[PDB]
DNA sequence: GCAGACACTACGAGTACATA
DNA sequence: TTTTTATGTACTCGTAGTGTCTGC
């Protein structure tokens, strides 16, 4: 900045006035906050018997049913809507779930399985190599573990872990680590 | 007093209000809009309402008309990233030699596939805010990214109070009466106008459309009232047969509605919902869901609908 | 050892047939499609001195394209492969040979029952017209004493009735009558001239294209007719 | 003869397509509104919809343009993507006609979800060019049209006649089918055939004409064609008498006889048992037979399914 | 007279009928096809039947042959919406310089994922109806959307009358004799051929397939007849295990009779009617009828049979 | 005996390569050899409700004895874009050496492959002159009816008494040869006979248990007692851990048809008799209403709730 | 019958108006956009010797570019279009006449309400300035004695009041006052000098451009103004 | 007369929907 | 108070690669 004066502009003004569209793209990606949802305002109405009209709100049978399926008191209604409610309207689905699900303040955290990304990768590798289903692959993994041939088999299969395969293994970019984990597999 | 555009032949397009005072809005919304027009400068506004025909585009143009702004009306679906990089920058950076505030109206900007462009727009707002303002209108507010919603004054149309609704409906009755008088439509019974207003609320566009449709013979008398207060797709015969547990009439009615099974089942559930006990609501939705789930599976469809009728007639507890 | 850019451009074409390739000691490379509908071979200049199986050939060639042309390629001490060039060094995992589909045996193509030739310009015109006329199969036959290639759109012409394109390749001189059908999807060859050897016996047969860089053999379609 | 004939078409329902509103067989209120529109000289934005096919939505959409003498552009709705709207449709709506006619865009079958975004681009379009051009949409599923577009158009629901309207429409369709048979060379040896064809496929007039063409393979509509149309596959005396006697073994023997044409058998059986049983037994008969018919396409052994139905009925019916 | 495709080695594909007269069809349906051919123009047709191997594809190709039509055969599972925009529109818009009718055969067009494509067809079939007609063949008519069914002549196969069935079985026996003559198979007992025809009706494809199967020795003696009648032996082991309430043997016998579940439930009802006390007949019919009517939605057949065995062993009283 | 030294799993290392090497019932082996003698191969569905009898092995052996260019496809991998792509390219193109081409689709009833089967409907008639399909299935009802019409359905097994004793003899001899080849010592031939008897006719499970015991080098008590694939679900049912069962439902939501039967089998031993009957009722109703359920995860979760609440473990 | 490059360029320019064309035997070709915005007619040197409708004119011109310039176009024995080259032959489909939107008869333009002339240089400058200032609409009007073309950008200027470009053609000795708005998208003609005729009768109107080889009729915008 | 400009296509990302 | 099932199909947007013609 040769001109040592200037009130100085923000990054957006510098990007736009200069018409450097890469700086404009970065400034726009600055606002790339993502993932907005208000499904739990609907579920609360189902749980707390609040008044709530879905004639103007977005509805999700999968999200509503999976949220209500976290507590056994609602499992009868979720089961019924999972059997005979698939061909119902979203309004009808919501109406039934309000009429049937018993009242209760039950909000909590969903039950999610925490997986060994390395073990998932090993099972997927064994299923790809031997063209078997998932449980057959797990049985192969058990047999190769209790035989000591697993380091040998993993060594023979280390070349099969392409960078697209790791996308199927796990979306966490820390997948790079497993990559090195598989590079050092001897 | 009323705004008439002789270029338009469609009634709802011919009588589009041109001023904030002419629009039929909630009291607080109209007060805020009058304040905006009085203070002389227009902020960044987002007018949204999922219910169509409440007045978003009308109010945007009326704000621009009251402020006497240099308005650039743009179809939101055409406001792609190149439009922001080009025409919007060209309009923002152009010098104004008349003191008119520059305002960009982006009508119906709630497309998800434009999110990226919207992000660019946000950055645009941080560079040319001192030169122009933006009035977005939308139906799905979730189609507008969160930074845009946060940077603007978000006004939710079609969300009135009960007294607001009474006042708006009286104003709409008066406006339809003035439209009839301008159009040469004789009003023999104001109950027709009242029924139209109450039936098509809060969609005013659809209200004026219904007025144009039912005012075909030029007179609004008791016949048009009976036509408006009617339901041409009413299912009442099936509902009354179920209420009476009339097996003969249900057996006769099964083939009448068996042709459009999906639509009839939907409408029948929708109608029974409001006329039965809560536990009857549970049972009705279970019965209807099962019967519809086995639609393509059953052999005789008319028999399947008669089976549904028997189930409902036996298990329903009408309030 | 380094891979000259002609070797790299050849391997990029060999990746179009098989996603991986097995390189064995010698100045000769080959690959075949996993379904066995096309096979390729090529005598290459750069000497291959150690056997190495590459499962991901396109990613390997992307690694190659980045770090110069005089890149020294070898196998690493641990067991993988190494690519060193002045400024950098990259390690690539060496896959087990059983993880890559290899043709195992160099197919000795029999003495051709029909021979012809096709210039690079003729093949380019044929590919352009096929991209234009939606042509997906070709039929090499004998028409009025010359050897012709007729291009058909098998989608809108399931029986190959209406000839959409025709090309002449010279006289035949022989005494046999044939109609070798070839699906255009099985021709992954790079532009150039090609000596075309069509062989058939009973129910078996093949079409070999000897080019200026590599030889591509392709399998005939099911309902090909000949009288050899 | 006041019946339009597309000489270029061989399919019956395409050959005999009405070209004016008066020729169209419509409910009273709908035809009245269409005559009113054609009388007003200008066409607003319209949406003709019905879950039932073959009610006349496309026919009336073309006939409105014909009567008003409007410069029409008939577009396949499924090709009406957003770039098509941004291109030819905008140019057509903004430009004027060389002869001063009103321009109308007919978007036939516009009720796909994949076009919703395109429909979104439309909701400003329809307000920008409403002075010069209008849009007439055809739909089967109204929910395939976004609610703003419904708000912008006059929505007209086909296939919703009154009882007297339905009687009159069936009379008119019978007369039209008789005139069409006269033109085509189909001898009508029994008018009951035409009446049953009209009543059977109502309100699908396209299916009506198509089935008229189907059952006229022998050039005549005699009594055999009537038995085929109404599905008269005989009597169910053995089953009924064995149910009344509670002859379980006879019913086990009779199941495979009627296992073949299950839908006809179950319908006829319901119709016959309805009259020969006590009112208390009527509800239970409908329950049993409805469950059995509902689970048909799932039952692995249809003969065993019919045996199960027979046993239930023989045990639970009270034969008056 | 019999049509032979020498390129085919599978017997059911070698002798595919090429004309309508060669087909074995009900009287009225064959008459309809002959009328369509005699008129010279083919309409939009939907040949359907849930029973495979009734001749829908055969009759489509035979109609196109007898009319001498420019036919485009298409696997319906590939007829996506771009396949209609491209190949189908190119085929239909191409002219007919020789006066032949253009017909598109969409074979097996009943996948749900094609619905949108089918929707794109309902205007297509009306734009090109002058020169191009469509012949859809399906197993599940519910996979065809209602507008397409409205635009077509729907013809349901595999649903003949008793006289039609008698005549079709006669013709099928004679055709099988001709096929065994051509193929070199010795028929030492015509009752074997009659048994094949009466067993596999109306799936003629499976009739010819089982003819190929049992003619492995080249001759059809009376020993093959006991193998064709499909009696599959008796079921004394399961009945005794049910009487003894021996759960382990019932679990062991579940996968055995999971081979042909339909035949097994039939034989089970037929036999166990005699071995349970009269007081248990209604309950046993409830159990067996439910287990049979819920089979098409049972994921695990062996588990379904185990469940049936447990119910019977727990609730039945034996004589 | 056929051996593949490149393989490290015994069931992949010692897989029979011919029909004769397979240990099958007399009638089944005779029909297979007649089919191979016929010269060509039609579309065939090998069905075996009882596992481990060798439908994959018999399919590969058919391809080997008829000398066919075989492409082996796992059913779960046989998605529709794979059928449109490589499979079409294989079936429409002739082989270099004039062999008949054959596609082997293993366990085609396992997953959401119904659209692939409805696609295969026309695929099988479009290329029948050059390519045949061999589908293997444990539950024949998983194969759509048009494919069953287009294929010859061969149901496996159900051996006679003489067949059973001869097959057990052959399996004992094969186990002895495999032990001699792998270097494993047989302390008692009665133990090998008892293993073959215990796991009959699940030969694959026998070879799998042998491969599990392989690390020792001898054969002693491989019949064990203690020392599963559903251990997590079983333990969480015993503990009445509703949250862990809810978390486990999506894991086995993959192959419900297999999991539900495996669950019934594993529960049968560990619970009281009246609870055996009750488990069969609950699991059977759940399996019965599976075809209606839209999300198998929730269906499996409800099954878990019911079982956990009603089981009286021993 | 060959196709001189002038004829092929004219056919390309016509293809920009309608994806397909219906050309009949003679030396006269015509086309009209499907949305009825522009119409074109022209005489050309090469002689059409058989009636045929092309569904995809652009692809036809592409395959024409794919062969020698002296290629021979004829009617094939099957009834399609046979393009004979040296060694190759291309068969292009003949479309059904009903499947191509074409004018029924050459529409005779009425007697003009105003007449002027546009030099090719002025037209080229107008097009290049339209690329520059991004003007999307024009208005032919009168400016104190002369006839002028005003160029507006309707995106940023919706009322057509801010004139971005201005061109002066000839003078107007009449007494009428008019303002014919034309959308730039409908200017589908090739460069050249054009006598510009303008016709208007109340609600009806059109603008014709007469060139030495082709005539182009263009529809005016709905909100044009005139007093004829 | 050849860089550059203009247009066209191929592909990744995001969204949406039906059915299981 | 929390928050996403697999497969197949369809659409739109942005951008980068790519081919091809042309202006001082
Ligand atoms: N009949 C048989 N004879 C010999 N070994 C068999 C037989 N059946 C299965 N096996 C063993 O099972 C393994 C593969 O079994 P597989 O064919 O997958 O059975 P399934 O398909 O029923 O699970 C092979 O390694 C083989 O050793
Ligand atoms: Mg608006
Ligand atoms: Mg229509
Ligand atoms: Mg078929
Ligand atoms: Mg297996």
CB < 7 A from strand H, the residues are A 34, 62, 86; B 112-113, 115; D 113, 116; E 112-113, 115; F 112, 114, 294-295; G 131
CA distance, residue E173 to nearest chain D CA (Å): 21
With beta carbons less than 8 A apart as the criterion, state whether F141 and A164 touch: no
CA distance, residue D179 to nearest chain B CA (Å): 27
Q: How many CB atoms lie within 10 A of CB E205?
A: 22
User: Quick check: A143 and F12 CB within 8 A?
Assistant: no
- Could you write out the DSSP letters of every residue in C130-179? HHHHT--EEEEEEETTEEEEEEE-TTT-TT--S--EEEEEEE--SS--EE
Query: Does some domain include residue F224?
Result: no
In chain D, positions 256-315 with C-beta closer than 7 Å to nucleic chain I are none
Q: Do B150 and B170 belong to one domain?
A: no
Q: E119: CA distance to ligand 5 center in Å?
A: 41
CA-to-C1' span, D191 to H3 (A)? 82
Residues 141-170 of B with CB under 8 A from A: 142, 145-147
CA-to-C1' span, G110 to I12 (A)? 44
Among the listed residues E159, E166, E172, the one whose alpha carbon sits nearest the alpha carbon of residue E50: E159
Q: Do chains D and E touch by CB distance (3+ pairs < 8 Å)?
A: yes
Which pairing describes strands G204-210 and G214-218: parallel, antiparallel, or unpaired?
antiparallel
Domain boundary residue among F180, F200, F219?
A: F219
Q: Do D130 and D169 belong to one domain?
A: no
Q: Do E183 and E98 belong to one domain?
A: no
Where do the DSSP E strands lie in C15-145?
A: 21-23, 26-32, 38-48, 52-54, 72-75, 81-85, 88-92, 114-118, 137-143
Query: Does some domain include residue D143?
Result: yes
> Which domains, and CATH codes, for chain C?
1-228 (3.70.10.10)
With beta carbons less than 8 A apart as the criterion, state whether F48 and F138 touch: yes
Counting ligand 1 atoms within 8 A of each CB, the residue from F32, F52, F171, F176 with the most, and so the one to mutate, is F52
Residues D195, G3: Cα–Cα separation, whole Å: 62
Give B133: exposed, middle or buried? Use CB within 10 Å, 0-12, 13-18, 19+. buried
H-assigned helices in chain B: 11-14, 27-39, 56-67, 81-83, 89-93, 115-125, 146-151, 162-183, 191-199, 204-214, 222-228, 236-244, 247-257, 261-273, 278-293, 301-315
The range of the structural domain enclosing residue D20 comes to 3-162
Which position has the token pair 């006035």? A17
Q: How many CB atoms lie within 10 A of CB A47?
A: 23
Q: Do F134 and F185 belong to one domain?
A: no
User: Which residues lie across from G74 on neighbouring strands?
Assistant: G82
Q: Do F128 and F16 belong to one domain?
A: yes
User: How many structural domains comprise chain B?
Assistant: 3
Phi-psi map region of E184: left, alpha, beta (phi>0 left; psi -120 to 50 alpha): left
With beta carbons less than 8 A apart as the criterion, state whether E56 and E47 touch: yes
Cα torsion angle, B33, B34, B37, B40, sign: negative
Residues D298, E290: Cα–Cα separation, whole Å: 11
Tell me: cis bond preceding F201? Omega within 30 of 0 counts. Answer: yes
H-assigned helices in G171-221: none
Q: Do F234 and F167 belong to one domain?
A: no
Q: Which among C34, C107, C221 has CB closest to F94?
A: C221
Q: Which nucleotide is nearest to A61 (CA to C1')?
A: I4
Residues B119, B109: Cα–Cα separation, whole Å: 12
Residues E257, E234: Cα–Cα separation, whole Å: 11
Residues B275, D64: Cα–Cα separation, whole Å: 41
User: Quick check: F92 and C204 CB within 8 A?
Assistant: no
B12 carries a ligand binding annotation: yes
Deposited resolution, Å = 2.6
Q: Backbone phi, then psi, for E75, in 5-degree steps?
A: -65, 120
Distances (CA, A) of F215 to F212, F218, G114: 7, 9, 103
**CATH assignment at residue B185:** 1.10.8.60
Domain boundary residue among B181, B196, B220?
A: B220
Q: Do E8 and E115 belong to one domain?
A: yes
Distances (CA, A) of E221 to E201, E210, F257: 21, 15, 41
Count CB pairs under 8 A between chains E and F. 143
Q: Which among A70, A138, A146 has CB closest to F229?
A: A138
Count CB pairs under 8 A between chains E and G. 31
Residues D291, D20: Cα–Cα separation, whole Å: 47
H-assigned helices in F253-295: 256-270, 273-288
Which pairing describes strands G21-23 and G52-54: parallel, antiparallel, or unpaired?
antiparallel
Sheet holding D133-139, edge to edge: D71-76, D103-108, D133-139, D46-49, D154-157
**CATH assignment at residue D256:** 1.20.272.10
Phi-psi map region of G89: left, alpha, beta (phi>0 left; psi -120 to 50 alpha): beta
Tokens of G174: 């009449």
Domain boundary residue among F160, F186, F210?
A: F160
Which pairing describes strands C26-32 and G204-210: parallel, antiparallel, or unpaired?
unpaired
Query: Does some domain include residue D228?
Result: no
Experimental approach was X-ray
Q: Which helix (H) or strand (E) holds F243?
A: helix F242-252
HSE-up of residue G200 (Cα within 13 Å, Cβ side): 24
What is the distance of C-alpha E21 from the center of its chain? 20
Tokens of F255: 């192959």
CA distance, residue C141 to nearest chain F CA (Å): 18
Give the chains touching F; criterion: ≥3 Cβ pairs < 8 Å.
A, C, E
Which pairing describes strands E186-187 and E219-220: parallel, antiparallel, or unpaired?
parallel
Longest dimension (CA), chain E: 79
Among the listed residues A165, A159, A155, A160, the one whose alpha carbon sits nearest the alpha carbon of residue A117: A165
Among the listed residues A30, G155, A14, the one whose alpha carbon sits nearest the alpha carbon of residue B122: A30
Contacts of A54-57 with CB under 8 Å at 24 or more apart are A54/A90, A54/A91, A54/A94, A55/A91, A56/B50, A56/B51
Distances (CA, A) of E28 to C15, D191, E156: 58, 21, 12
Residues C72, C74: Cα–Cα separation, whole Å: 7
User: Quick check: A131 and F106 CB within 8 A?
Assistant: yes
What is the distance of C-alpha A46 from the center of its chain? 24
Tokens of F53: 């009898």
Residues D56, D26: Cα–Cα separation, whole Å: 8
Query: Does some domain include residue D79?
Result: yes
Residues E28, E25: Cα–Cα separation, whole Å: 8
- Could you write out the DSSP letters of every residue in D233-277? ----HHHHHHHHTT-HHHHHHHHHHHSTTHHHHHHHHHHHHHHSS
CA distance, residue F13 to nearest chain E CA (Å): 28
Among the listed residues E251, E292, E291, the one whose alpha carbon sits nearest the alpha carbon of residue F276: E251
With beta carbons less than 8 A apart as the criterion, state whether D317 and B319 touch: no
Q: Three-class SS of residue A144?
A: helix
Among the listed residues C15, C25, C5, C87, the one whose alpha carbon sits nearest the alpha carbon of residue C56: C15
With beta carbons less than 8 A apart as the criterion, state whether A77 and A100 touch: yes
Residues F284, F292: Cα–Cα separation, whole Å: 14
Q: Do F31 and F133 belong to one domain?
A: yes
Q: Which helix (H) or strand (E) holds C216?
A: strand C215-218
Residues B76, B55: Cα–Cα separation, whole Å: 17
Query: Does some domain include residue D230?
Result: no
User: Quick check: A134 and F247 CB within 8 A?
Assistant: no
Q: F14: CA distance to ligand 1 center in Å?
A: 9
DSSP, res C107: -
Q: Which nucleotide is nearest to F290 (CA to C1')?
A: H20
Tell me: cis bond preceding D227? Omega within 30 of 0 counts. Answer: no
Query: Does some domain include residue B225?
Result: no
**CATH assignment at residue F93:** 3.40.50.300
H-assigned helices in chain C: 5-14, 57-66, 120-133
User: Quick check: C155 and E73 CB within 8 A?
Assistant: no
For residue B105, give the ligand nearest its CA. Answer: 2
**Is F31 part of the contact surface with chain A (CB cutoff 8 Å)?**
no
Q: F45: CA distance to ligand 5 center in Å?
A: 13
CA-to-C1' span, G127 to H2 (A)? 25
Residue numbers in G near C168 (CB within 8 A): 87-88
Q: Do B204 and B259 belong to one domain?
A: no
Residues F283, E307: Cα–Cα separation, whole Å: 8
Give the torsion through C-alpha atoms of F250, F253, F259, F263, to 10 deg. Answer: 50
Residue numbers in A near B128 (CB within 8 A): 16
Give the residue from D53, D123, D271 with the most B CB atoms within 10 Å of its CB, the best one to mutate.
Answer: D123
CB-based burial, C34-71: b 16+ in 10 Å, e otherwise: ebbbbbbbbebeeebeeebbbbbbebbbeebeebeeeb
Nearest residue by C-alpha to atom 17 in ligand 1? F54
Among the listed residues A160, A172, A99, A80, the one whose alpha carbon sits nearest the alpha carbon of residue A124: A160
Tokens of G218: 């263009």
Tell me: cis bond preceding B202? Omega within 30 of 0 counts. Answer: yes
Q: Three-class SS of residue B45?
A: strand
HSE-up of residue E11 (Cα within 13 Å, Cβ side): 25
With beta carbons less than 8 A apart as the criterion, state whether C197 and C148 touch: no
Cα nearest neighbour of C152 on chain G: G91
CA-to-C1' span, B144 to I11 (A)? 20
CA-to-C1' span, C91 to H13 (A)? 31
Among the listed residues B319, B4, B2, B24, the one whose alpha carbon sits nearest the alpha carbon of residue B173: B24
Which position has the token pair 């492959």? F113
Query: Does some domain include residue B227?
Result: no
Q: Do F145 and F67 belong to one domain?
A: yes
Q: Backbone phi, then psi, for B110, in 5-degree steps?
A: -100, 40
DSSP, res E131: T
Q: Is the CB of B117 under 7 A from strand I?
A: yes
Residues E208, F150: Cα–Cα separation, whole Å: 10
With beta carbons less than 8 A apart as the criterion, state whether D29 and D160 touch: no
CB-based burial, B231-270: b 16+ in 10 Å, e otherwise: eeeebebbbebbeeebbebbbebbbbbbbbbebbbbbbbe
With beta carbons less than 8 A apart as the criterion, state whether D64 and D34 touch: yes
Contacts of F5 by beta carbon, 8 Å cutoff, 6+ apart: F13
Residues G150, G130: Cα–Cα separation, whole Å: 11
User: How many residues appear in chain D?
Assistant: 320
Residues B24, B36: Cα–Cα separation, whole Å: 17
Residue numbers in B near D290 (CB within 8 A): 303-304, 306-308, 310-311
User: Which residues lie across from D134 on neighbouring strands?
Assistant: D104
With beta carbons less than 8 A apart as the criterion, state whether G170 and G117 touch: yes
For residue D58, give the ligand nearest its CA. Answer: 3
Tokens of D97: 């006609």
Which pairing describes strands C146-152 and C165-171: parallel, antiparallel, or unpaired?
antiparallel
Q: Is the CB of A16 under 7 A from strand I?
A: no
Q: Do E149 and E138 belong to one domain?
A: yes
User: How many residues appear in chain B?
Assistant: 319
Cα torsion angle, D309, D313, D315, D316, sign: positive
Q: Which among F6, F93, F127 has CB closest to C219?
A: F93
Give chain B's end-to-end CA distance (angstroms, integer): 49
Give the residue from G87, G92, G94, G95 with the most C CB atoms within 10 Å of its CB, the best one to mutate.
Answer: G87
Residues B161, B183: Cα–Cα separation, whole Å: 32
Sheet holding F131-137, edge to edge: F69-74, F101-106, F131-137, F44-47, F152-155
Residues E41, E103: Cα–Cα separation, whole Å: 10
Contacts of D95 by beta carbon, 8 Å cutoff, 6+ apart: D103, G35, G37, G183, G186, G219, G220, G221, G222
B137 carries a ligand binding annotation: no
Phi-psi map region of D292: left, alpha, beta (phi>0 left; psi -120 to 50 alpha): alpha
CB-based burial, F53-79: b 16+ in 10 Å, e otherwise: bbbbbbbbbbbbbbebbbbebbbbebb
Among the listed residues F73, D294, E249, the one whose alpha carbon sits nearest the alpha carbon of residue B296: D294
Residues F132, F126: Cα–Cα separation, whole Å: 11
Tell me: cis bond preceding E202? Omega within 30 of 0 counts. Answer: yes
Tokens of E21: 């007269």
Ligand 1 cavity residues, CB under 6 Å = F 11, 14-16, 22-24, 48, 51-57, 203-204, 207
**Is E101 part of the contact surface with chain G (CB cutoff 8 Å)?**
no
Residue numbers in D near E265 (CB within 8 A): 300-301, 304
Cα torsion angle, E217, E218, E220, E225, sign: positive
Q: Do B181 and B209 belong to one domain?
A: yes
């Amino acid at each position: 900045s040769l001109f040592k004066d200037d009130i100085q502009l923000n990054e957006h003004q510098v990007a736009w006035y200069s018409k450097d569209w890469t700086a404009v793209q970065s400034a726009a990606d600055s606002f790339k906050e993502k993932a907005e949802n208000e499904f739990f305002e609907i579920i609360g109405a189902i749980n707390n018997k609040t008044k709530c009209s879905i004639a103007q709100k977005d509805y999700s049978k999968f999200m509503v049913e999976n949220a209500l399926s976290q507590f056994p008191e609602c499992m009868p209604a979720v089961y019924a809507m999972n059997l005979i409610g698939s061909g119902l309207s979203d309004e009808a689905h919501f109406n039934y779930l309000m009429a049937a699900v018993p009242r209760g303040k039950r909000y909590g955290k969903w039950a999610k399985l925490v997986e060994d990304s390395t073990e998932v990768l090993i099972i997927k590798l064994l299923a790809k190599r031997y063209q078997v289903n998932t449980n057959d692959a797990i049985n192969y993994k058990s047999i190769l573990t209790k035989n000591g041939k697993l380091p040998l088999v993993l060594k023979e299969l280390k070349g099969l872990v392409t960078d697209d395969f790791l996308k199927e293994v796990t979306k966490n970019v820390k997948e790079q680590k497993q990559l090195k984990k598989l590079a050092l597999e001897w | 007093m009323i705004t008439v555009n002789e270029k338009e032949h469609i009634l709802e397009q011919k009588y589009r209000p041109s001023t904030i005072d002419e629009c039929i809005l909630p009291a607080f919304d109209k007060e805020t809009f009058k304040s905006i027009t009085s203070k002389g400068k227009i902020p960044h506004i987002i007018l949204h309402s999922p219910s169509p025909g409440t007045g978003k585009t009308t109010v945007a143009k009326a704000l621009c008309h009251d402020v006497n702004a240099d308005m650039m009306f743009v179809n939101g679906s055409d406001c792609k990233i190149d439009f922001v990089r080009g025409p919007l920058t060209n309009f923002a950076s152009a010098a104004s030699f008349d003191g008119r505030q520059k305002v960009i109206v982006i009508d119906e900007f709630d497309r998800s596939g434009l999110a990226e462009s919207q992000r660019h727009l946000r950055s645009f707002m941080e560079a040319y805010s001192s030169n122009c303002s933006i009035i977005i209108t939308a139906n799905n507010i979730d189609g507008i990214i969160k930074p845009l919603q946060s940077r603007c004054r978000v006004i939710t149309f079609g969300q009135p109070t009960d007294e607001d609704k009474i006042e708006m409906m009286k104003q709409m009755i008066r406006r339809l009466t003035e439209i009839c008088k301008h159009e040469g439509i004789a009003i023999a019974d104001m109950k027709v106008v009242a029924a139209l207003v109450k039936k098509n609320f809060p969609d005013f566009r659809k209200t004026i459309g219904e007025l144009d449709s039912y005012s075909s013979k030029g007179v609004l008398d008791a016949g048009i009232l009976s036509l408006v207060t009617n339901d041409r797709g009413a299912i009442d015969d099936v509902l009354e047969s179920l209420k009476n547990k009339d097996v003969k009439q249900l057996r006769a009615l099964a083939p009448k509605y068996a042709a459009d099974y999906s639509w009839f089942v939907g409408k029948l559930a929708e109608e029974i919902y409001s006329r039965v006990t809560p536990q009857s609501i549970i049972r009705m939705y279970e019965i209807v869901g099962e019967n519809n789930q086995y639609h393509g599976i059953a052999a005789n469809t008319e028999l399947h609908l008669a089976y549904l009728f028997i189930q409902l007639a036996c298990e329903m507890q009408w309030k | 050892m380094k891979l000259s850019k002609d070797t790299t451009a050849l391997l990029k074409n060999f990746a179009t047939i098989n996603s991986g390739i097995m390189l064995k000691s010698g100045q000769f490379i080959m690959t075949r499609a996993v379904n066995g509908t096309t096979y390729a071979e090529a005598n290459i200049s750069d000497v291959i001195d150690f056997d190495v199986a590459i499962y991901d050939l396109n990613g390997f060639l992307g690694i190659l394209s980045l770090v110069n042309d005089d890149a020294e390629i070898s196998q690493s001490e641990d067991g993988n492969i190494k690519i060193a060039d002045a400024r950098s060094t990259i390690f690539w995992p060496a896959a087990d040979p059983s993880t890559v589909v290899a043709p195992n045996k160099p197919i000795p193509f029999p003495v051709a029952s029909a021979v012809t030739e096709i210039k690079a310009e003729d093949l380019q015109q044929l590919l352009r017209v096929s991209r234009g006329l939606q042509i997906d199969t070709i039929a090499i036959t004998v028409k009025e004493g010359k050897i012709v290639i007729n291009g058909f759109n098998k989608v809108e012409d399931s029986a190959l009735t209406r000839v959409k394109y025709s090309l002449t390749l010279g006289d035949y001189d022989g005494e046999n009558t044939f109609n070798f059908i070839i699906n255009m999807a099985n021709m992954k060859m790079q532009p150039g001239n090609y000596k075309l050897l069509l062989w058939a016996k009973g129910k078996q047969g093949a079409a070999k294209f000897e080019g200026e860089h590599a030889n591509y053999v392709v399998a005939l379609e099911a309902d090909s007719t000949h009288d050899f």
